């Protein structure tokens, strides 16, 4: 499995943000004792996106001029990646 | 014969798992000398 | 700069993956088993 | 030939691929409140490339103003409100530099290579030509003949004409399938100052322009200059988001007097920003390339399948041997042409027309389509690894020189919104699965409608119907 | 005007712009002057073919699965009749 | 001790609050998931799905 | 798992492993060695559980049949 | 404690695996017809709960060396299944440091 | 990690990583040097110029070319260009090329560099080129040939195609061939770079073997690398057993010097009757007006000539370049050992145009130190552009070593371009205009300019 | 640049045997053609028969540890890094052949 790393939606006119990502899921059954699940939302990562989201929350809620970010289709939402902490 | 190991050095097998190094687990990527040798290069 | 492996070497990690005492019950300072109407289930409960 | 060949008896040593990963300085990026972007990659040196990349090609024309983008490119160099053409040329000459303008289907760029001490003057001239250039009718009437001569010259490039045919066949009814220069009747009479002004107003907006710096440059200085000059651009309407439909079919130009035949066969693929972009790149590198100087030394299953039938003695039980006199293939190359919406993935074969009503091209296309089906069904691990390593090397080979690095930065900034770090790119390249690659190959190749472009002796090149019947097999 | 003592622009105008020799002109026989006797197109113009023959686009289906499915399903009865017969 | 200093600092910090308590502009997760499915290509079918589908 | 023959030969009493070049299986009827790999009960389960996998996959026809 | 494997080849409606499960055990018509009740939410990481637990944490998330430890690959499992993870981890690490000092 | 039944991903950051006030950083070392040269005790010479890049080129330079031919062997080197790349005794063409191509290495077509050597160039990541198998394959190719008749037939076909295509698609390159052929009339530099028609039937395996015996010797082979550390290269070309199995001999070949005519002078071809007109230019006449210029032997005069050539090129080519600007002119400076050519190749040339070019050159002669600064700056911009590119670095190294025998890194040329002097350029132009011209015509039309009408 | 340092050409190929024919050819000499008699050559040509070939000896070399005179000769030549020993490629078999 290899999907996109978690991102942050941000709506401009409304000025409202929120994290998002792809959640894998499967039919429930017995587990495995010798296995702690790896990072599945952010594959092949040390799970820093949580820290980046926590750090960037103050930046985003305070009001960010994200005109330099791509949009999502024809809506008012733009995607901010959580690869590195957001300062702007 | 497959992948034959060379030498009888230590491998973390089922019987032997070794003594954890909590100092390295906690101080990962952070130097120890700022705490054990304060203010020295 | 990497030495011969030893059991107390600098690069030995805690065993939290491989299960040993499966049927134990963790004990220590733990929250009260409060019950509420409609609130999301706690991770550490028998119900999911 | 009395000399023995020991290569058939000896045990040979196999070289293996081991990549080199030099850490380059990260590509910094900033954005003005207007939205105009500023990207910069600095490296130790004495010369730097500074340019402006614009996201407005000929893709946005409706056959009433086809070629207006190229007309605008030629008109930007005819003088501005402050400077004249002579003054611009004098400034460039004093800097000892050349101002290059390049126009594509979905990108344009104006760039200058200079010393680090001429960066502010270069940026000044770029802003002057891009924003403040006056485009009067008289000058518009004085460039029509030069553009006509350029049209007649570019019509004489067989490869460019072939790709224009491929795009005209694939994308009919949308500007993406029109030629960059446009119809001759449009060059001489139709394009007007009104069309040029409308194009500039609509497509030269803030959020669709980037200032790119590569080499011994200062990102802070670039940002200050960009705010000084490019801060007043309008936040115009968003880039058009329409549906460009792919039409399978054929465009065949008959010229039996040509010495070589060029055949391009392409399939529809998703855009450049689709998650399948890396898998399609790996497919392109999997099909590989072949040149006549290699002989039988074709390193891919594809090219090899098409080449060894001109060395096979073709001895059969009930039929006479039929071995080709010589290998007629001049070259085979796998290509991928992506665009924000769509893509064309295929192969481009150049070979001699051969004896009239022969079987050379029948065999070539037979084996090409068989190999496409085979890779759609199964791919080997060793060839998968070869393809990934070749993609690594090819991606690295394009970053030679400040101008090439700046071009890559600008294209990625306009397409993906920001440059992807090479390591990050490579991080996504080692996570590809052979099963995923097989699925991508089967999705777009098997039992799909292709687009064919032919230039040369079409007497021997198979027609579309036959080609449509070989994208699938009875066995499957 | 002079770049390092050279009137480069002048030199350019005298050196950098050679004349280009184009194709020879073919004298037209007087019976070929009427336009329709020197064709430049077949029967139908693009506009015509774009209004009558090309299917209506389906933006949700950019790979013609609908057309392929319909054609193969419509072929099935031919094979069925031939087999039974 | 450094442990005491850190504990006291954290205790004082949480009095101000945490993002889950202080953040005002924040969309519901259902709207974000619906937008994800309605606009972005599925990582399996490589196309845009209308809504959530099990198969 | 992988054979330990190099260590066994370079061990301390290599004469005990001369029989290992006759018609003789290593795991069943050879003298165990100080540095041998640890053998588990259900090797399929032992190798699959730490990777999060159940031993048998229904999509594989061979596994489904087994 | 389960690795789904390859999500692509198990998401199809009809599969050899699903038919085998129907024949021998683990799958059936109740799964095709009624997936809301017999597959339901399913088992996997919870992005919403991870985000909630991350945003509930104090500055201990910034000051913790967790992300460079060999257990950084278990970050999401613990963040979801260990409420108040980062504060406890920060106290643990500061305890180690003060023992060292 | 280094455990059994333990997650491979369960590994911490490397020991060369530090975490300081948040974001992490990495610790590493320094590398790289300048230009380095060595000679193997068997005669082979190795030149290296490391620049720290990740992409490297490795070239085996073999001493053979038109300057070593006569009127009866004309074009034989072209066969040698390909025959050595075909099947050998110990490794066929299939074994080598595929083995190199499947290892992520780009194998370039062999080329003739200064009419005096054949370069076999390979391009790839430095780590892939440093291994001793690539160099081993090149050693096999150069030291143990086979020259099979069927391969020679294939090479005959290839050379016919090369000549015909260059004539049809590279009229300026063909014009350069004519320019040299008539420039150095009775001297080695005036030999043809293309196989003449007659010799197409004459050259075969026996002639190739005789030429290989004549040119055999480790003294006729050189190795040049541009992004490989010097020692590694020495570790790669010295691990070959085949080098140890080869006859040890230092055998050099020498060629005489040259003089210069060219001329008001003409190669006649009716292109409109030879090729289809749609996809090639068939209605044009190619005129090369050239003068004698210094070679690479004297670095000062070479740098002055570079400045002069850049000044002439910038004063003719358009300053503002568009996408589809056609190719009508070229200002060329072909530099050799102790002699060279500098001139203007054009289509539909005119007496007025050629007079203007000569007057521009003379004007360049009279420039002062202050006026020479602009042209020196433009030449420096070009030189730095060469410095920053590994392909340009390789080209410069090969040319500098081949013509003079003394390597010369591109950066060194920069140091020589900013030491150019007005007196030096004045003397160089006095040398240029003090000798007859070459008004090498090639093409078809009868209205072409003539020297008597210029001078 | 102006100075060419002298580096030895093939230091790795000094003090290795360079006599062809070597001494191994004396030790592992096969003056009577193939070393295995007809019946033996008949039994090693089939995977099944081969098992019976060694199983006839209740305690003898298995089919994996068994070596021939020619195999030992090649091993001996390779072990001594003789300059003039050009290694030969074993017959590579595709699927069906195997
Ligand atoms: C030359 C070889 C071409 C080839 O690959 O033929 C394989 C040939 C046809 O496969 P195909 O070329 O992929 O055609 C499939 C198209 O969908 C066929 O659809 P279509 O639209 O092309 O319709 C034409 C098709 C069927 O339609 C007709 O023939 C017209 C209707 C029947 C007319 C008589 C009443 O004609 C045939 O099947 C002709 C068969 C004779 C050999 C060709 O395979 C078989 O006949 C079966 C192969 C497997 C069994 C072994 C048979 C040999 C022993
Ligand atoms: C006919 C039926 C014959 C008996 C059942 C055979 C089932 C397997 C058939 C098959 O195709 O297997 C391929 C399959 C190939 O294995 P693979 O998956 O490729 O893995 C390679 C290795 O096995 C490496 O894998 P591994 O070592 O990890 O083993 C995989 C693991 C996989 O196993 C599991 O995951 C589950 C195993 C459960 C074992 C019991 C645990 C305690 C109870 C738990 C609750 C379950 C109860 C059983 C199920 C009912 C539940 C309601 O264990 C097994 O598969 C074998 C475990 C022991 C059970 C089978 C014993 C067969 C030999 C004894 C015969 C006498 C007793 C039976 C009646 C006859 O074979 C095996 O895995 C078994 C090894 C060979 C067994 C036969 C040995 C010779 C027996 C000769 C005497 C036969 C009986 C007397 C005949 C007299 C003349 C008429
Ligand atoms: C082999 C040569 C090449 C042939 C290629 C294909 C030809 C074109 C396609 C076929 C068209 C005709 C199909 C007829 C089907 C309808 C009749 C039928 O079968 O009924 C089933 C029914 C089935 O009856 P039943 O008895 O099985 O049904 C059960 C009924 N209960 C239980 C109540 C008892 O009748 C028959 O089968 C009757 C016997 C066969 C009748 C044959 C009719 C003529 C066939 C040829 C016609 C074609 C033109 C002439 C060719 C002459 C050649 C010499
Ligand atoms: C009634 C109609 C039955 C036939 C139609 C098909 C039914 C569905 C497919 C058959 C297999 C059952 C589903 C797969 C499975 O693993 O089922 C486990 C099931 C225990 O689950 P259960 O308690 O039945 O849950 C539903 C509560 N009413 O227990 C079993 O599987 C027991 C054996 C099968 C029982 C079939 C009867 C219906 C069970 C619901």
3-class SS letters over J62-85:
CCCCCCCHHHHHHHHHHHCCCCCC
Distance CA E74, CA E70 (A): 6
Distance CA I178, CA I192 (A): 8
Indicate the burial class of I402 (C-beta count within 10 angstroms; 0-12, 13-18, 19 or more). buried
From G39, G44, G62, give the residue whose CB has the most ligand 2 atoms within 8 Å, as the site to mutate. G44
Distance CA E76, CA E84 (A): 12
Q: How far is CA I386 from CA D24, F4, I380, I389, J1, in A?
A: 20, 63, 10, 6, 19
Distance CA D164, CA I92 (A): 40
- The 8-class DSSP code of residue H41 comes to T
Q: Record the tokens describing residue I166, joined without a space.
A: 């260059």
| Strand-pair partners of I47 | I37, I224
Distance from CA of F20 to the nearest CA of H (A): 5
Q: Are strands A7-11 and A77-81 parallel, antiparallel or unpaired?
A: antiparallel
3-state percent breakdown (helix, strand, coil) of chain B, nearest 5: 20, 0, 75
Which helix or strand (DSSP H or E) is residue D347 part of?
Answer: strand D342-351
Q: Whose CA is nearest to atom 40 of ligand 3?
A: E85
Q: How long, in residues, is chain A?
A: 88
Q: Contacts of residue I58 in chain D, CB cutoff 8 Å?
A: none
Chains I and C touch (3+ CB pairs under 8 A): yes
Is D219 in contact with D421 (CB distance < 8 Å)?
A: no
Chains C and E touch (3+ CB pairs under 8 A): no
Distance CA D59, CA D69 (A): 9
Q: Whose CA is nearest to atom 38 of ligand 2?
A: G42
Q: Record the tokens describing residue J2, joined without a space.
A: 């102006």
Q: By the CB < 8 Å criterion, does D4 face chain J?
A: no
Distant-in-sequence, close-in-space partners of D84: CB < 8 Å, separation ≥ 6: none
Is D250 in contact with D463 (CB distance < 8 Å)?
A: yes
Distance CA D132, CA G49 (A): 69
Distance CA I172, CA I345 (A): 7
Q: Which of I359, I45, I87 is nearest to I217 (CA)?
A: I45
Q: Record the tokens describing residue B8, joined without a space.
A: 């009888």
Distance CA I18, CA B30 (A): 6
Residue G53: CB atoms within 10 Å:
18
At I249, give phi and psi (nearest 5°). Answer: -160, 135
Q: Which of I141, I150, I91 is nearest to I121 (CA)?
A: I141
- DSSP-based three-state secondary structure for H59: helix
Q: Record the tokens describing residue F22, joined without a space.
A: 């202080």
Counting one residue from B and one from H, how many pairs have CB atoms under 8 Å apart? 29
Nearest residue in chain A measured CA to CA from H37: A27
Distance CA H26, CA A26 (A): 13
Q: By the CB < 8 Å criterion, does B26 face chain I?
A: no
Chains G and A touch (3+ CB pairs under 8 A): yes
Distance CA D151, CA B21 (A): 73
Nearest residue in chain H measured CA to CA from B38: H101
Residue I362: CB atoms within 10 Å:
13
Q: What is the resolution of this structure in A?
A: 3.1
Is D97 in contact with D130 (CB distance < 8 Å)?
A: no
Q: Contacts of residue J55 in chain G, CB cutoff 8 Å?
A: 23
Is I337 in contact with I278 (CB distance < 8 Å)?
A: no
**Ligand 1: does its nearest atom lie under 6 Å from the Cβ of D476?**
no
Q: How far apart, in Å, do the first and last CA atoms of chain J sit?
A: 58
Nearest residue in chain I measured CA to CA from E22: I283
Residue D84 C-alpha from the chain's centroid? 34
From H20, H25, H30, H40, give the residue whose CB has the most ligand 4 atoms within 8 Å, as the site to mutate. H30
Which helix or strand (DSSP H or E) is residue A50 part of?
Answer: helix A49-62
Q: Are strands D209-215 and D249-254 parallel, antiparallel or unpaired?
A: unpaired
Indicate the burial class of H82 (C-beta count within 10 angstroms; 0-12, 13-18, 19 or more). middle
- The 8-class DSSP code of residue D389 comes to H
Is I253 in contact with I215 (CB distance < 8 Å)?
A: yes
Q: Which of I412, I454, I427 is nearest to I37 (CA)?
A: I412
Distance from CA of I3 to the nearest CA of G (A): 12
Distance from CA of D13 to the nearest CA of J (A): 11
State the distance from the centre of ligand 2 to the C-alpha of G66, rounded, in angstroms. Answer: 9
Distance CA D32, CA D230 (A): 9
Buried b (16+ CB within 10 A) or exposed e, C15-27: eebbeeeeeeeee
State the distance from the centre of ligand 4 to the C-alpha of H37, rounded, in angstroms. Answer: 13
Is A19 in contact with H51 (CB distance < 8 Å)?
A: yes
Tell me which residue has tokens 């289709």. A73
Chains with 3 or more CB pairs under 8 A to chain J: D, G, I
Q: D227-233 long-range CB contacts below 8 Å, 24 or more apart?
A: D227/D32, D229/D123, D229/D124, D229/D127, D229/D131, D230/D32, D230/D34, D230/D36, D230/D127, D230/D131, D230/D206, D231/D32, D231/D34, D231/D36, D232/D34, D232/D131, D233/D34, D233/D36, D233/D131, D233/D204, D233/D205, D233/D206, D233/D209
Whether the bond into B6 is cis, omega within 30 of 0: no
Question: Which ligand 4 atom is at minimum distance from the Cα of H28?
Answer: 9
Distance CA I221, CA I42 (A): 11
Interface residue of H20, H22, H25, H44 to substitute, partner G, most G CBs within 10 Å: H20
Distance CA D274, CA I188 (A): 59
How crowded is the C-beta side of I128, counted as CA atoms within 13 Å? 29
Buried b (16+ CB within 10 A) or exposed e, D439-467: bbbbbbbbebbbbbbbbbbbebbbebeeb
Q: Whose CA is nearest to atom 3 of ligand 3?
A: E85
Residue I303: CB atoms within 10 Å:
26
Q: For chain I, give the secondary structure using H, E and C.
A: CCECCCCCCCCCCCCCEEECCCCEEECCCCCCCCEEEEEECCCCEEEEECCCCCEEEEEEEECCCHHHCCCCCCCHHHHHHHHCCCCCCCCCHHHHHHHHHCCCEEECCCEECCCCCEEEEEEEEHHHHHCHHHHHHHHHHHHCCCCCHHHHHHHHHHHHHHHHHHHHHCHHHHHHHHHHHHHCCCCHHHCCCCCCCCHHHHCCHHHHHHHHHHHCCHHHEEEEECCCCHHHHHHHHCCCHHHHCCCCCCCCCCCCCCCCCCCEECCECCHHHCCCCCCCCCCCCEEEEEEEECCCCCHHHHHHHHHHHHHHHHCCCCCEECCCCCCCEEEEEEECCCCEEEEEEEECCCHHHHHHHHHHHHHHHCCCHHHHHHHHHHHHHHHHHHHCCHHHHHHHHHHHHHHHCCCCCHHHHHHHHCCCCHHHHHHHHHHHHCCCCEEEEEECCCCCCCHHHHC
Residue E63 and residue D89: Cβ atoms within 8 Å?
A: no
At J66, give phi and psi (nearest 5°). Answer: -80, 135
Nearest residue in chain I measured CA to CA from E23: I283
Q: How long, in residues, is chain E?
A: 85
Distance from CA of I128 to the nearest CA of B (A): 26
Q: Kindly calculate the radius of gyration of chain A based on its CA atoms and give it in whole angstroms.
A: 16
Is I328 in contact with I353 (CB distance < 8 Å)?
A: no
Residue I240 C-alpha from the chain's centroid? 28
From E79, E82, E85, give the residue whose CB has the most ligand 3 atoms within 8 Å, as the site to mutate. E85
Q: By the CB < 8 Å criterion, does H79 face chain F?
A: no
- The 8-class DSSP code of residue F48 comes to B
- DSSP-based three-state secondary structure for D171: coil
Distance CA D149, CA D152 (A): 5
Distance from CA of I451 to the nearest CA of J (A): 43
Residue A16 and residue F27: Cβ atoms within 8 Å?
A: yes
Which helix or strand (DSSP H or E) is residue D193 part of?
Answer: helix D193-203
**Ligand 2: does its nearest atom lie under 6 Å from the Cβ of G42?**
yes
Distance CA J55, CA J62 (A): 8
Q: Are strands I105-107 and I118-125 parallel, antiparallel or unpaired?
A: antiparallel
How crowded is the C-beta side of D60, counted as CA atoms within 13 Å? 23
Distance CA I173, CA I112 (A): 13
Distance CA I106, CA I58 (A): 11
| Strand-pair partners of I62 | I118, I221
- DSSP-based three-state secondary structure for G16: helix
Buried b (16+ CB within 10 A) or exposed e, H2-16: bbbbebbebbeeebe
Residue B12 and residue I4: Cβ atoms within 8 Å?
A: yes
Tell me the longest C-alpha to C-alpha distance in chain D.
83
**Ligand 4: does its nearest atom lie under 6 Å from the Cβ of H37?**
no
Q: F36-39 long-range CB contacts below 8 Å, 24 or more apart?
A: F36/A9, F36/A20, F36/A22, F39/A72, F39/A73, F39/A75, F39/A77
Residue G51 and residue H5: Cβ atoms within 8 Å?
A: no
Distance CA D380, CA D387 (A): 11
Question: Which ligand 3 atom is at minimum distance from the Cα of E85?
Answer: 10
Q: Which of I40, I45, I241 sits opposite J9 (nearest CB)?
A: I40
Q: Record the tokens describing residue I103, joined without a space.
A: 């290892």
State the distance from the centre of ligand 1 to the C-alpha of J58, rounded, in angstroms. Answer: 61
- Under the phi-then-psi rule, with left for phi > 0, alpha for psi from -120 to 50, and beta for the rest, what region is D125? alpha
At I268, give phi and psi (nearest 5°). Answer: -100, 125
Indicate the burial class of D65 (C-beta count within 10 angstroms; 0-12, 13-18, 19 or more). buried
Query: Ligand 3: which residues within 6 Å by Cβ?
Result: E 82, 85
Q: By the CB < 8 Å criterion, does F25 face chain A?
A: yes
Is D336 in contact with D289 (CB distance < 8 Å)?
A: no
How crowded is the C-beta side of F25, counted as CA atoms within 13 Å? 17
Is A22 in contact with A56 (CB distance < 8 Å)?
A: no
- DSSP-based three-state secondary structure for D18: coil
Residue D439 and residue H6: Cβ atoms within 8 Å?
A: no
Residue I363 and residue E4: Cβ atoms within 8 Å?
A: no
Catalytic center residues of D:
73
Q: Contacts of residue H80 in chain C, CB cutoff 8 Å?
A: 43
Is D87 in contact with D132 (CB distance < 8 Å)?
A: no
Q: How far is CA I24 from CA A5, D108, H57, H79, in A?
A: 20, 38, 22, 22
Tell me which residue has tokens 């205009």. I433
Q: Record the tokens describing residue I358, joined without a space.
A: 């000569």
Tell me which residue has tokens 């540095």. G35
Distance CA D14, CA H7 (A): 37
Chains with 3 or more CB pairs under 8 A to chain A: C, D, F, G, H, I
Tell me which residue has tokens 């010589």. D326
Tell me which residue has tokens 């004249």. D84
Angle D386-D392-D396 from CA coordinates, rounded to 5°: 140
Is I395 in contact with I378 (CB distance < 8 Å)?
A: no
| Strand-pair partners of H43 | A26
- DSSP-based three-state secondary structure for D267: strand
**Ligand 1: does its nearest atom lie under 6 Å from the Cβ of D474?**
yes
Q: Which of I290, I451, I431 is nearest to I365 (CA)?
A: I431
Chains I and B touch (3+ CB pairs under 8 A): yes
Distance CA D348, CA D166 (A): 11
Distance from CA of H21 to the nearest CA of B (A): 34
Residue I157 and residue D326: Cβ atoms within 8 Å?
A: yes
Distance CA A62, CA I183 (A): 76
Q: Which of B4, B7, B8 sits opposite G2 (nearest CB)?
A: B4
Distance CA I390, CA I413 (A): 15
Angle H39-H44-H45 from CA coordinates, rounded to 5°: 145
Is D204 in contact with D130 (CB distance < 8 Å)?
A: yes
Tell me which residue has tokens 């290694």. J87
Q: Contacts of residue C18 in chain I, CB cutoff 8 Å?
A: 5-6
Tell me the longest C-alpha to C-alpha distance in chain B.
55
Is I50 in contact with I58 (CB distance < 8 Å)?
A: no
Q: Are strands D342-351 and D261-270 parallel, antiparallel or unpaired?
A: antiparallel
**Ligand 2: does its nearest atom lie under 6 Å from the Cβ of G56?**
no
Distance CA E57, CA D172 (A): 12
Distance CA A61, CA A10 (A): 10
Q: Which of D99, D131, D109, D105 is nearest to D54 (CA)?
A: D109
């Amino acid at each position: 499995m290899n999907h996109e790393r978690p991102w942050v939606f941000l709506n401009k006119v409304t000025g409202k943000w929120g994290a998002c990502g792809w959640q894998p899921f499967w039919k429930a059954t017995s587990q495995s004792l010798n296995y702690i699940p790896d990072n599945f939302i952010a594959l092949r990562t040390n799970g820093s996106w949580v820290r980046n989201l926590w750090q960037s929350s103050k930046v985003l809620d305070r009001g960010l001029n994200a005109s330099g970010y791509p949009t999502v289709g024809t809506t008012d939402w733009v995607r901010i990646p959580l690869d590195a902490p957001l300062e702007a | 014969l497959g992948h034959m190991r060379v030498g009888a050095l230590w491998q973390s097998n089922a019987n032997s798992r070794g003594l954890p190094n909590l100092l390295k687990e906690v101080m990962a990527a952070e130097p120890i000398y700022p705490y054990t040798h304060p203010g020295l290069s | 700069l990497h030495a011969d492996p030893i059991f107390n070497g600098s690069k030995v990690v805690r065993s939290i993956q491989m299960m040993r005492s499966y049927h134990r019950l963790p004990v220590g300072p733990e929250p009260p088993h409060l019950k509420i109407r409609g609130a999301p289930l706690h991770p550490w409960s028998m119900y999911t | 030939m009395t000399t023995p060949s020991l290569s058939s008896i000896l045990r040979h040593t196999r070289p293996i691929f081991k990549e080199t990963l030099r850490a380059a300085r990260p590509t910094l990026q900033n954005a003005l409140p207007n939205g105009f972007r500023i990207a910069s990659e600095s490296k130790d040196g004495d010369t730097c490339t500074v340019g402006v990349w614009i996201d407005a090609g000929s893709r946005w024309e409706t056959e009433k103003n086809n070629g207006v983008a190229h007309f605008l490119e030629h008109m930007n160099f005819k003088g501005t409100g402050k400077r004249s053409r002579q003054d611009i040329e004098f400034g460039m000459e004093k800097m000892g530099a050349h101002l290059n303008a390049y126009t594509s289907r979905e990108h344009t760029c104006y760039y200058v290579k200079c010393f680090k001490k001429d960066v502010p003057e270069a940026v000044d001239i770029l802003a002057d030509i891009l924003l403040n250039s006056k485009r009067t009718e008289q000058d518009l009437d004085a460039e029509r003949q030069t553009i006509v001569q350029e049209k007649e010259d570019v019509e004489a490039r067989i490869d460019e004409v072939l790709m224009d045919h491929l795009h005209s066949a694939a994308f009919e009814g949308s500007g993406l399938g029109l030629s960059i220069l446009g119809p001759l009747e449009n060059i001489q009479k139709s394009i007007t100052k009104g069309m040029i002004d409308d194009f500039v107003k609509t497509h030269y907006t803030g959020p669709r322009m980037a200032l790119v710096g590569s080499g011994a440059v200062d990102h802070g200085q670039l940002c200050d200059l960009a705010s000084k000059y490019f801060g007043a651009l309008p936040t115009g309407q968003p880039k058009p988001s329409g549906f460009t439909r792919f039409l399978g079919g054929d465009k065949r130009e008959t010229n039996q007097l040509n010495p070589l035949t060029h055949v391009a066969v392409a399939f529809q693929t998703p855009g450049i920003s689709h998650p399948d972009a890396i898998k399609i790149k790996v497919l392109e590198q999997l099909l590989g390339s072949y040149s006549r100087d290699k002989g039988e030394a074709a390193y891919s299953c594809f090219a090899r399948a098409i080449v060894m039938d001109f060395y096979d003695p073709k001895v059969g039980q009930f039929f006479r041997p039929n071995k080709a006199g010589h290998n007629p293939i001049h070259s085979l190359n796998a290509f991928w042409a992506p665009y924000s919406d769509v893509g064309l993935l295929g192969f481009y074969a150049i070979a001699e027309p051969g004896k009239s009503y022969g079987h050379e091209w029948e065999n070539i296309l037979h084996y090409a389509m068989r190999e496409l089906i085979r890779v759609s069904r199964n791919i080997s691990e060793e060839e998968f690894e070869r393809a990934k390593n070749q993609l690594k090397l090819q991606t690295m080979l394009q970053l030679d020189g400040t101008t090439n690095i700046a071009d890559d930065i600008g294209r990625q900034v306009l397409s993906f919104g920001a440059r992807v770090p090479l390591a990050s790119f490579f991080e996504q390249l080692d996570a590809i699965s052979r099963e995923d690659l097989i699925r991508v190959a089967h999705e777009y190749f098997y039992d799909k409608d292709p687009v064919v472009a032919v230039i040369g002796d079409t007497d021997n090149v198979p027609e579309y119907d036959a080609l449509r019947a070989v994208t699938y097999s009875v066995d499957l | 005007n002079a770049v390092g003592g050279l009137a480069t622009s002048q030199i350019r105008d005298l050196v950098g712009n050679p004349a280009k020799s184009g194709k020879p002109v073919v004298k037209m026989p007087p019976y070929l002057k009427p336009s329709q006797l020197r064709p430049s197109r077949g029967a139908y113009s693009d506009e015509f073919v774009r209004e009558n023959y090309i299917k209506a686009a389906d933006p949700e289906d950019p790979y013609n699965y609908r057309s392929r499915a319909f054609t193969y399903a419509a072929k099935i009865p031919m094979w069925a009749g031939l087999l039974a017969g | 001790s450094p442990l005491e200093k850190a504990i006291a600092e954290i205790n004082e910090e949480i009095k101000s609050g945490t993002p889950w308590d202080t953040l005002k502009n924040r969309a519901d997760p259902k709207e974000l998931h619906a937008l994800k499915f309605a606009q972005l290509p599925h990582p399996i079918t490589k196309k845009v799905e209308g809504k959530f589908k099990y198969f | 798992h992988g054979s330990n023959l190099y260590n066994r030969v370079h061990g301390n009493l290599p004469q005990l492993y001369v029989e290992q070049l006759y018609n003789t299986d290593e795991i069943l009827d050879t003298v165990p060695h100080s540095s041998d790999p640890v053998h588990h009960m259900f090797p399929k389960c032992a190798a699959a559980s730490p990777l999060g996998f159940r031993p048998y996959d229904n999509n594989k026809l061979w596994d489904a049949f087994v | 404690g389960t690795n789904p494997g390859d999500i692509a080849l198990n998401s199809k409606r009809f599969t050899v695996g699903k038919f085998v499960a129907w024949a021998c055990g683990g799958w059936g018509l109740k799964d095709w017809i009624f997936p809301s009740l017999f597959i339901g939410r399913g088992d996997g990481p919870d992005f919403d709960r991870i985000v909630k637990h991350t945003l509930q944490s104090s500055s201990a998330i910034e000051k913790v060396n967790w992300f460079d430890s060999p257990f950084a690959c278990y970050t999401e499992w613990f963040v979801e299944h260990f409420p108040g993870f980062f504060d406890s981890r920060y106290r643990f690490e500061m305890s180690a440091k003060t023992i060292l000092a | 990690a280094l455990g059994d039944s333990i997650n491979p991903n369960q590994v911490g950051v490397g020991d060369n990583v530090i975490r300081v006030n948040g974001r992490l950083f990495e610790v590493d070392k320094v590398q790289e040097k300048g230009l380095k040269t060595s000679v193997l005790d068997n005669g082979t010479k190795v030149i290296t110029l490391d620049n720290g890049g990740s992409v490297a080129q490795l070239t085996f330079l073999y001493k053979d070319g038109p300057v070593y031919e006569n009127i009866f062997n004309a074009g034989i080197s072209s066969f040698m260009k390909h025959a050595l790349t075909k099947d050998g005794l110990t490794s066929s063409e299939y074994i080598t090329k595929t083995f190199l191509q499947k290892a992520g290495i780009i194998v370039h077509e062999p080329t003739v560099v200064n009419k005096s050597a054949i370069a076999f160039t390979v391009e790839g990541f430095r780590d892939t080129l440093a291994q001793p198998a690539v160099a081993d394959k090149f050693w096999q190719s150069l030291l143990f040939p086979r020259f099979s008749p069927e391969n020679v037939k294939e090479v005959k076909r290839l050379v016919e195609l090369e000549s015909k295509e260059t004539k049809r698609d590279s009229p300026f390159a063909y014009l350069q061939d004519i320019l040299h052929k008539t420039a150095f009339k009775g001297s080695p530099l005036g030999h043809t770079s293309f196989v003449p028609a007659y010799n197409l039937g004459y050259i075969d395996s026996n002639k190739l073997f005789d030429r290989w015996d004549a040119h055999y010797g480790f003294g006729n082979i050189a190795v040049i690398a541009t992004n490989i550390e010097h020692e590694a290269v020495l570790a790669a070309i010295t691990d070959s057993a085949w080098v140890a199995r080869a006859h040890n001999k230092v055998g050099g070949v020498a060629a005489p010097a040259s003089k210069y005519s060219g001329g008001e002078g003409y190669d006649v071809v009716h292109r409109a009757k030879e090729f289809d007109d749609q996809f090639t230019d068939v209605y044009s006449t190619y005129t090369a007006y050239a003068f004698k210029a210094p070679g690479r032997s004297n670095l000062k005069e070479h740098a002055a000539s570079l400045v002069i050539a850049q000044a002439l090129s910038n004063a003719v080519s358009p300053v503002l370049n568009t996408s589809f600007a056609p190719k009508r002119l070229e200002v060329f400076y072909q530099a050799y050992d102790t002699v060279g050519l500098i001139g203007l190749s054009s289509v539909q040339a005119s007496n007025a145009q050629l007079k203007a070019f000569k007057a521009a050159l003379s004007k360049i002669g009279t420039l002062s130190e202050a006026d020479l600064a602009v042209h020196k700056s433009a030449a420096l911009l070009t030189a730095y552009g060469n410095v920053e590119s590994w392909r340009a670095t390789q080209a410069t190294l090969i040319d500098s070593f081949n013509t003079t025998g003394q390597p010369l890194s591109p950066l060194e040329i920069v140091s020589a371009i900013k030491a150019v002097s007005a007196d030096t350029v004045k003397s160089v132009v006095a040398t240029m205009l003090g000798s007859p011209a070459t008004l090498v015509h090639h093409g078809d039309s009868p209205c072409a300019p003539t020297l008597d009408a210029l001078q | 640049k102006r100075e060419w340092h002298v580096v030895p050409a093939t230091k790795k190929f000094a003090d290795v045997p360079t006599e062809w024919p070597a001494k191994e050819h004396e030790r592992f000499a096969l003056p009577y053609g193939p070393s295995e008699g007809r019946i033996v050559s008949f039994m090693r040509a089939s995977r099944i028969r081969n098992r019976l070939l060694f199983t006839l000896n209740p305690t003898g070399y298995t089919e994996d540890t068994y070596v021939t005179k020619e195999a030992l000769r090649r091993q001996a030549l390779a072990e001594s890094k003789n300059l003039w020993y050009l290694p030969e490629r074993p017959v590579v078999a595709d699927q069906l052949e195997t």
